[PDB]
């Protein structure tokens, strides 16, 4: 090969950027204006598409006083309640009449064909020594999900043990972007646990694929907005194993969790509580083995220039603990075993977001933070990567 | 679309790295014992293949005492003769006999098939206000090859009005890479003369492709060494023009030279003086209109970590002047009109480096800076885009 | 096997050109693994990152068994490498009448810690307290002015001594018995301690006791040409200006390091605090380290803190806990004959 | 005369071709110190071409 390098943030303008202002000439053309008193007959948001087209909704109003509408469950008192909703997340919740007739927007934005949504204000913001991490940092005779990896200037975390879906089908690992790709060197070379300029270590492989930004009309599948410059940011890189490296010293087992299932696939047409409100787990080499729960999928954030940004998955830890720290970026997020079933992957951690983000409560407890993540499964057909689970699958395609 | 960084330069490593034992020991290796009295017969004549696959043979002996070796002419007394040779760039010549037995290397290195090489010692050392440049940086009513471009961070120069060879066949302009792309985040929308955060300007379009590193197996077509991590520095970015912008105010004419013909290609198998010693010209936004001569081709240097880097073309200015300044990266290099024939392009200026070893001499004159640059033909072969020169072909 | 000072020390100086390039610095006191130390002697190797041996190159791997002159063998293993609101802070830096074995010594810009009581053998056994070789010897002053809690320029000033004895470079062979390093140039890290009481300063208050342990035995002469129980794996205390009353344990010995250039200097007896707590902190490089009272017998201070090592590095023992700090030290049996001294443990014969 | 004499440190030219009177009547060359040999090594090399 050589190199390559196609499309930065910049391509896909007129023709389509007006095929988006066509389907959206009706976030109000189908209904009966504000009829307070009951529950817009029609029905109610019973999905996350059903409720994706409703913050997608009256978006001028919502996007007027806000910082990032999302889409979870009516949160109330302090614990997810079970009624779909539109978290007009804010800077700091407040009182009623002390408001300039406009600052606690209305809890009844409506929809396309009688679909009324629900609003409830929250407020937002922007090494753990043990022996389950002292092994992953290159002190155990088997590598796999969670192991330390570094190339020349960055430190990351070994993700899943992957294999391609095409002509060659090499076997490597799905790490993230900031630990993989740069260009001052003609090639990128990872090393475990350290490169030869930082300490000991052995050769791992080279980067051969990457992606950093995807437009939403192909990622999510729906327009999901009114500003047509939407970029659903994702992160992944296949890294084929070297020809000299011993394959026998690879374990396809998450040390700390157990045995993985296959894949959890998020399709936005299903009961809403099927993914939101479910316990999750994660093993990475900056926290050990932590646990959390899904809070609200499909966060939106549009910055000053007007660039759309959807960040898929929001997770907040359990029992007031942090889900991850800086350095855990790249570790798989695993759906907690559902009473006898094997645990399943739902996403790679896009980043621990150091202190970038804080889903706060008006209850008597401090600012517990959150974390992010990508939809692993729509990142598996954008890099043609696959999830390998059984340890007899490692020596089954390489063989 | 999206984003997507590929990079399989990795296409080497084991299956093809033993496939490079045809350099030594195998086939093109120990061939027919040499001889003294019978000077190598003569070594035929005309070739880059004729004299690269001799320099490729003894790369270790050369590299033992060098600063990089290219293929040019046997420079004697300062001028350019017709005897093919290789210039081994060095720190300093020094006397003939106060050497340890080898610092002035033997000039009789041989190759595969009884062809003897030839060596040299050169010594290597690791605006322009007028009205041809103020008509490029904003004060004009037409855009084209030579005009200034800036995206949101840096500044560049329009290369040439180009169109894609496949798909929808979009029409834009081929600049170099960091007028656009760079690192940590891409470079997406290019303005002329400036983006709206620096002054006035208009939208042109957006980058859509690009390249940056190639392997010395597919670019030149021959191994050209023994180091299996040899790389070609290439620089390009196709930029389809925007829909709102009027295309009726675009001129595919280089103001200052005239009108170019079609691309000239180097085939590495021809009389060697057909490209070396030829007068070349250019048009830039920071120098204006300068002329020069091609001194040597196929530069080669491997750095400390041990990866070779071929930098194609070496161009030095005429009458002791400099070809360019640090404003000209992206400008086309055009062969000077050969007595009535229309000029033809040979490469985009990779950048006025001229600091990784100046072409020095022992004549009574200071160092003269040179230029680098891709050999166009195989850069408009990778991104699959041609060059529009006729003012009526642009309309169609 | 190995049971003697030289049994390790001369193996060290022979394999030294075969030792110490895989990693910087190695200590030879005992084999430690599985969390604790066993009775197996060794040449334990400090490493930056403890990589499992499968991720190692054969040349730079661990040679488990080494052998040299005579017919004595040994073993090799791996180690890693890189306030107090109590009574004693107030009553050794101020509010106490007298100075006992660990009163804070206040330099112009630094502060150290009282050690033990000097004497001499030749000429005039002049009496003055002794402390380390960075508090007093500055990079700008050949001599410096020492005095109880704080100096005159930052507090109420009433002073104690001025340096004439300032030994810096101790030679190697007269000090560690035999050749220790195959590298030609290695003098010693030789922070010494002798310094007057300043002639007329009151002597009726100067008491001979450590405030928190009591009566201490004498100077001990180090001898590991006896069984390993003499110096390795022992229990030691800690009394200091900044740290308190902690109890440490002796792990290492003559360990030499390579800081930036590769300066390999003799970092004498190393101790680590118990219960995974810091042994000492900054400004405490004058505190004595006694062997614990062995069944009634009055304890003996072998060690002196050589410097503030809280910011130097830590050795991790991988026992589900973070890296724990280590402290340097200098043998008192060596300094005692370096500078003509005599340690006094009792009070009746201070002026005799 | 005129030719450089440079060994490490920095570089300098050659003073002259000279003869000593006292010692044993030999031949040498003269040097100007600061460009070389001042105090670091009064007994180090002096090289022509380059060291």
mmCIF file of N, CA and C in Angstrom, chain A residues 66-70 87-93 121-126 299-301 311 314-316 352-361 366-372:
data_model
loop_
_atom_site.group_PDB
_atom_site.id
_atom_site.type_symbol
_atom_site.label_atom_id
_atom_site.label_comp_id
_atom_site.label_asym_id
_atom_site.label_seq_id
_atom_site.Cartn_x
_atom_site.Cartn_y
_atom_site.Cartn_z
ATOM 1 N N UNK A 66 -31.057 25.828 26.615
ATOM 2 C CA UNK A 66 -30.570 24.528 26.864
ATOM 3 C C UNK A 66 -29.071 24.383 26.869
ATOM 4 N N UNK A 67 -28.553 23.306 26.248
ATOM 5 C CA UNK A 67 -27.104 22.978 26.177
ATOM 6 C C UNK A 67 -27.018 21.545 25.739
ATOM 7 N N UNK A 68 -28.157 20.905 25.601
ATOM 8 C CA UNK A 68 -28.106 19.593 25.092
ATOM 9 C C UNK A 68 -29.209 18.660 25.329
ATOM 10 N N UNK A 69 -30.360 18.901 24.790
ATOM 11 C CA UNK A 69 -31.386 17.902 24.917
ATOM 12 C C UNK A 69 -30.869 16.455 24.650
ATOM 13 N N UNK A 70 -31.419 15.424 25.302
ATOM 14 C CA UNK A 70 -31.061 14.035 25.094
ATOM 15 C C UNK A 70 -32.352 13.353 25.067
ATOM 16 N N UNK A 87 -34.938 15.222 28.135
ATOM 17 C CA UNK A 87 -34.171 15.972 29.027
ATOM 18 C C UNK A 87 -33.565 17.211 28.497
ATOM 19 N N UNK A 88 -34.295 18.300 28.557
ATOM 20 C CA UNK A 88 -33.801 19.622 28.160
ATOM 21 C C UNK A 88 -32.720 19.989 29.098
ATOM 22 N N UNK A 89 -31.734 19.131 29.218
ATOM 23 C CA UNK A 89 -30.671 19.364 30.142
ATOM 24 C C UNK A 89 -30.299 20.782 30.214
ATOM 25 N N UNK A 90 -29.900 21.235 31.381
ATOM 26 C CA UNK A 90 -29.622 22.656 31.594
ATOM 27 C C UNK A 90 -28.374 23.044 32.355
ATOM 28 N N UNK A 91 -28.327 24.302 32.751
ATOM 29 C CA UNK A 91 -27.174 24.808 33.423
ATOM 30 C C UNK A 91 -27.440 24.737 34.865
ATOM 31 N N UNK A 92 -28.686 24.922 35.261
ATOM 32 C CA UNK A 92 -29.047 24.734 36.663
ATOM 33 C C UNK A 92 -30.544 24.859 36.839
ATOM 34 N N UNK A 93 -31.223 23.758 37.157
ATOM 35 C CA UNK A 93 -32.678 23.754 37.287
ATOM 36 C C UNK A 93 -33.204 24.952 38.066
ATOM 37 N N UNK A 121 -36.621 18.909 33.851
ATOM 38 C CA UNK A 121 -35.326 19.582 33.870
ATOM 39 C C UNK A 121 -34.345 18.895 34.813
ATOM 40 N N UNK A 122 -33.126 18.661 34.328
ATOM 41 C CA UNK A 122 -31.986 18.302 35.165
ATOM 42 C C UNK A 122 -30.908 19.348 34.911
ATOM 43 N N UNK A 123 -29.741 19.198 35.533
ATOM 44 C CA UNK A 123 -28.662 20.159 35.347
ATOM 45 C C UNK A 123 -27.375 19.438 34.970
ATOM 46 N N UNK A 124 -26.594 20.073 34.096
ATOM 47 C CA UNK A 124 -25.472 19.440 33.415
ATOM 48 C C UNK A 124 -24.216 20.273 33.625
ATOM 49 N N UNK A 125 -23.102 19.763 33.107
ATOM 50 C CA UNK A 125 -21.824 20.465 33.147
ATOM 51 C C UNK A 125 -20.890 19.823 32.126
ATOM 52 N N UNK A 126 -19.677 20.357 32.026
ATOM 53 C CA UNK A 126 -18.651 19.797 31.154
ATOM 54 C C UNK A 126 -17.276 19.879 31.811
ATOM 55 N N UNK A 299 -27.108 11.605 22.956
ATOM 56 C CA UNK A 299 -26.855 12.985 23.342
ATOM 57 C C UNK A 299 -26.594 13.839 22.105
ATOM 58 N N UNK A 300 -27.041 15.092 22.158
ATOM 59 C CA UNK A 300 -26.795 16.068 21.104
ATOM 60 C C UNK A 300 -26.003 17.225 21.690
ATOM 61 N N UNK A 301 -25.138 17.830 20.876
ATOM 62 C CA UNK A 301 -24.363 19.002 21.283
ATOM 63 C C UNK A 301 -23.978 19.758 20.017
ATOM 64 N N UNK A 311 -23.311 11.783 20.486
ATOM 65 C CA UNK A 311 -22.317 10.988 21.200
ATOM 66 C C UNK A 311 -22.968 9.727 21.775
ATOM 67 N N UNK A 314 -24.698 7.362 27.018
ATOM 68 C CA UNK A 314 -24.390 8.019 28.288
ATOM 69 C C UNK A 314 -24.485 6.969 29.388
ATOM 70 N N UNK A 315 -23.436 6.847 30.201
ATOM 71 C CA UNK A 315 -23.394 5.888 31.300
ATOM 72 C C UNK A 315 -22.956 6.603 32.571
ATOM 73 N N UNK A 316 -23.656 6.326 33.670
ATOM 74 C CA UNK A 316 -23.307 6.831 34.993
ATOM 75 C C UNK A 316 -23.095 5.637 35.913
ATOM 76 N N UNK A 352 -13.051 8.480 29.042
ATOM 77 C CA UNK A 352 -13.522 8.655 30.400
ATOM 78 C C UNK A 352 -13.969 10.079 30.653
ATOM 79 N N UNK A 353 -13.687 10.956 29.687
ATOM 80 C CA UNK A 353 -14.060 12.365 29.724
ATOM 81 C C UNK A 353 -13.544 13.053 30.981
ATOM 82 N N UNK A 354 -12.361 12.636 31.453
ATOM 83 C CA UNK A 354 -11.690 13.156 32.645
ATOM 84 C C UNK A 354 -12.646 13.809 33.635
ATOM 85 N N UNK A 355 -12.883 15.110 33.456
ATOM 86 C CA UNK A 355 -13.932 15.824 34.171
ATOM 87 C C UNK A 355 -14.903 16.498 33.209
ATOM 88 N N UNK A 356 -14.891 16.111 31.932
ATOM 89 C CA UNK A 356 -15.731 16.719 30.901
ATOM 90 C C UNK A 356 -17.132 16.121 30.983
ATOM 91 N N UNK A 357 -17.930 16.666 31.895
ATOM 92 C CA UNK A 357 -19.315 16.259 32.003
ATOM 93 C C UNK A 357 -19.749 15.900 33.406
ATOM 94 N N UNK A 358 -20.944 16.345 33.790
ATOM 95 C CA UNK A 358 -21.452 16.070 35.126
ATOM 96 C C UNK A 358 -22.974 16.119 35.154
ATOM 97 N N UNK A 359 -23.622 14.957 35.132
ATOM 98 C CA UNK A 359 -25.072 14.911 35.269
ATOM 99 C C UNK A 359 -25.422 15.068 36.744
ATOM 100 N N UNK A 360 -25.925 16.244 37.104
ATOM 101 C CA UNK A 360 -26.119 16.601 38.503
ATOM 102 C C UNK A 360 -27.560 16.317 38.920
ATOM 103 N N UNK A 361 -27.806 16.336 40.225
ATOM 104 C CA UNK A 361 -29.144 16.184 40.779
ATOM 105 C C UNK A 361 -29.375 17.311 41.771
ATOM 106 N N UNK A 366 -23.457 15.121 45.975
ATOM 107 C CA UNK A 366 -22.549 15.831 45.106
ATOM 108 C C UNK A 366 -22.701 15.544 43.625
ATOM 109 N N UNK A 367 -21.896 16.235 42.814
ATOM 110 C CA UNK A 367 -22.012 16.121 41.354
ATOM 111 C C UNK A 367 -21.408 14.847 40.785
ATOM 112 N N UNK A 368 -22.155 13.746 40.789
ATOM 113 C CA UNK A 368 -21.666 12.526 40.159
ATOM 114 C C UNK A 368 -21.545 12.733 38.652
ATOM 115 N N UNK A 369 -20.434 12.273 38.081
ATOM 116 C CA UNK A 369 -20.175 12.482 36.664
ATOM 117 C C UNK A 369 -20.704 11.309 35.838
ATOM 118 N N UNK A 370 -20.532 11.417 34.526
ATOM 119 C CA UNK A 370 -20.908 10.371 33.584
ATOM 120 C C UNK A 370 -19.724 10.038 32.680
ATOM 121 N N UNK A 371 -19.986 9.182 31.692
ATOM 122 C CA UNK A 371 -19.001 8.802 30.691
ATOM 123 C C UNK A 371 -19.709 8.649 29.351
ATOM 124 N N UNK A 372 -18.921 8.456 28.294
ATOM 125 C CA UNK A 372 -19.475 8.348 26.950
ATOM 126 C C UNK A 372 -19.219 6.971 26.354
#
